[PDB]
Design a protein around this nucleic acid. Structure first.
Ligand SMILES: O=C1Nc2ccccc2/C1=C1/Nc2ccccc2C1=O
Lengths: 290, 327
DNA sequence: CATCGGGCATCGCGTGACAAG
DNA sequence: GCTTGTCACGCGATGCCCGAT
């Protein structure tokens, strides 16, 4: 087939599909405007679409429509806090369907007062001095919920927003702010503990062994996961392995799995000695499903 | 003139009227074509029709003018805090909407993406998965065309009825709405000029760090004071490299030089970073005094290569995990 | 209550000029 | 200097409207 004839046929097909797309979009316009659906030609449909758009009417959506789309897609609530003091500069109404807290409990407050104390220091490392993403525990006896926060550091005050003289923000003088969204959310594994039993290193295999992620174990004491009957046995094992450096001590206990289910675990522990001072750096445990 | 010319001119005048009403800047409108004009008009009408059904403020006892101004941009604030972009896709795999920040992440103008086939922006090997999530919660990963190659992106969203789309039947009757994916798409996460970083650290004889230079503070993330209050260096070493490092520490004690070893250190971000280090004993009066380790960061790939080519087969050699460090 | 030819309007087809990449 | 695409235009086949049968 000569190339000129094939080119002409391709061009004719392109123009045909182009006209097809145009007529299909005109049909969609007829379906989208009031009294067209309730038959008109292309010109009448176009004029009625022009009138409808004129009545409806820069961004494609409004701020409220964009917020609606984002929240309908992935929940969350917006909060803008100061980097210096953590002062809550802004919090959206979405904090009520997320934390069961009114906007009053967050306004005039600080983010450190709204998170669990065990997170405060961590929070500081996320506020001092672009993108940010962390996980904390927010308030709601008191109750806490794990909240995943992701956002950014914006130079304050924001452009376009007017700051009146008699406004509570006029005297603050914050230079940067965190603008973020908060949302609600037969094998073995090795581990490293201190002399007290705190998980300082967790193998990734723990997920397949006890159902926990390594971050869920790190920092916690292993005895917290132990059955109260087996707790003194596990504690005496951790105490005796320190006195017998080099010797391997095995112990069976009941580990509380991710589903709050008891699993029989065999933990074999020994100590790591410094090649110079011969001091105990940590305790290496191999925890095996039974 | 002639009838064809006059009819085409009437059609083009109506098309220009439609183009002048599109909610886009004038520079975007002027570079549009007739097909794109009609497409974006249909898209705007469908979006307004959906929000006419789905949609409709700071608390009344907390109203200040500045907080009202922030409320009037809450949506853009959420969009900028997304670290990604919004994507609403219908059951017909048509992009019902994409937020502007898509241009920031893939290089596509939102005016060229809206009301187009979403598969045009996806890797073929991933397309079969995407429609699998198209047909309530959703959390998956797909690779999308990036004009800034491709980019792997995590999608988190839901399937919700896209109301007000006026899908008409064969009978001319209205059809019920179809499900649509409302999703937020973000990038993924796991060294630069610091490949040429050669930094030194001073240690006690038990490898307790007591000094660190500037490039060391930049690589490991600890201040010089923070690096010393966390015990010996074995608290920093990956559990897969502890016995390897201990053997080479014995070698250094028995020779004064450890040689080049490749092992993982824990940063202040609680991340693991590979280093090629060489610890040397410095003597005072013929008795050892302190260790001087001069090192170089490595990419994870060549670090894994060195670990694969380890001369000594030792326990926990191929173990992976996370760690913490306290004072 | 129709039916019937006028002349202009609608509309789909193919091709050519022209340009962005 | 090739490719894909946009826009206009010529051109008939029907569409609509409507006096005139
Ligand atoms: O080269 C290091 N840089 C560091 C920075 C912080 C903490 C430790 C180290 C290093 C060690 N090189 C070693 C070689 C053999 C045995 C132990 C060790 C170490 O602890």
């Amino acid at each position: 087939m000569d190339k000129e004839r094939l080119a002409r046929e391709n061009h004719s097909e392109i123009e045909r599909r182009r006209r097809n797309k145009m007529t299909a979009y005109i049909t969609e316009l007829s379906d989208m405007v009031p009294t067209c659906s309730a038959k008109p030609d292309k010109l009448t449909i176009l004029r009625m679409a022009v009138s409808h758009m004129k009545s409806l009417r820069p961004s494609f959506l409004t701020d409220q429509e964009l917020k609606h789309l984002i929240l309908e897609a992935a929940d969350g609530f917006l909060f803008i806090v100061s980097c210096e003091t953590g002062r809550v500069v802004y919090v959206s109404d979405s904090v009520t369907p997320v934390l069961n807290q009114p906007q009053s409990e967050w306004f005039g407050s600080t983010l450190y007062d709204q998170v669990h104390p065990d997170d405060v220091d961590k929070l500081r490392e996320q506020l001092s001095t672009s993108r940010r993403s962390f996980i904390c525990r927010m308030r709601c006896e008191p109750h806490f919920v794990v909240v995943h926060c992701t956002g950014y550091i914006k130079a304050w005050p924001p452009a376009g927003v007017s700051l009146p003289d008699d406004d509570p923000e006029a005297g603050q003088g914050s230079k940067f702010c965190l603008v973020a969204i908060g949302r609600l959310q037969p094998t073995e594994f090795i581990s490293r503990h201190n002399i007290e039993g705190i998980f300082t290193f967790v193998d990734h295999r723990c997920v397949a062994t006890v159902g926990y992620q390594p971050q869920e174990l790190l920092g916690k004491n292993i005895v917290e996961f132990c059955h109260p009957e087996d707790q003194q046995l596990l504690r005496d094992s951790f105490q005796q392995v320190v006195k017998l450096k080099g010797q391997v001590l095995s112990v069976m206990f009941r580990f509380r799995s991710k589903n709050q289910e008891w699993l029989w675990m065999r933990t074999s522990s020994f100590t790591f000695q410094n090649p110079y001072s011969d001091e105990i750096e940590y305790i290496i445990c191999t925890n095996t499903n039974v | 003139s002639n009838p064809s010319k006059r009819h085409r001119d009437r059609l083009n005048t109506e098309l220009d009227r439609l183009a002048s009403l599109l909610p886009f800047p004038q520079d975007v409108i002027n570079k549009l074509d007739k097909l794109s004009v009609l497409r974006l008009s249909v898209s705007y009408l469908r979006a307004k029709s959906f929000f006419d059904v789905s949609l409709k403020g700071v608390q009344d006892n907390c109203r200040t003018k500045f907080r009202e101004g922030l409320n009037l941009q809450e949506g853009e604030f959420l969009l900028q805090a997304l670290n990604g972009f919004v994507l609403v896709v219908t059951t017909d795999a048509l992009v019902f909407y994409a937020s502007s920040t898509i241009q920031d992440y893939l290089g596509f103008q939102q005016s060229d993406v809206i009301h187009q086939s979403v598969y045009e922006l996806i890797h073929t090997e991933d397309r079969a998965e995407f429609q699998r999530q198209l047909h309530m919660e959703r959390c998956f990963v797909c690779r999308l065309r990036c004009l800034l190659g491709f980019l792997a992106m995590n999608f988190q969203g839901r399937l919700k009825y896209l109301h007000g789309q006026n899908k008409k039947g064969k009978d001319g009757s209205i059809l019920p709405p179809q499900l649509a994916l409302f999703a937020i798409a973000t990038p993924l996460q796991p060294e630069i000029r610091t490949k040429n970083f050669i930094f030194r650290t001073k240690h006690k004889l038990d490898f307790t760090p007591t000094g660190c230079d500037a490039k060391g503070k930049i690589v490991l993330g600890y201040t010089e004071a923070e690096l010393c209050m966390r015990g010996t260096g074995y608290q920093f070493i990956h559990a897969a490299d502890m016995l390897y490092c201990a053997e080479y520490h014995v070698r250094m004690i028995k020779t004064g030089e450890s040689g080049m070893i490749v092992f993982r250190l824990l940063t202040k971000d609680n991340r693991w970073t590979w280093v090629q280090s060489n610890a040397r004993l410095v003597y005072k009066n013929g008795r050892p005094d302190y260790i001087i380790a001069t090192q170089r960061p490595l990419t994870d790939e060549e670090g894994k290569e060195h670990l694969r080519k380890r001369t000594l087969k030792l326990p926990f050699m191929f173990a992976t995990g996370e760690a913490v460090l306290y004072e």
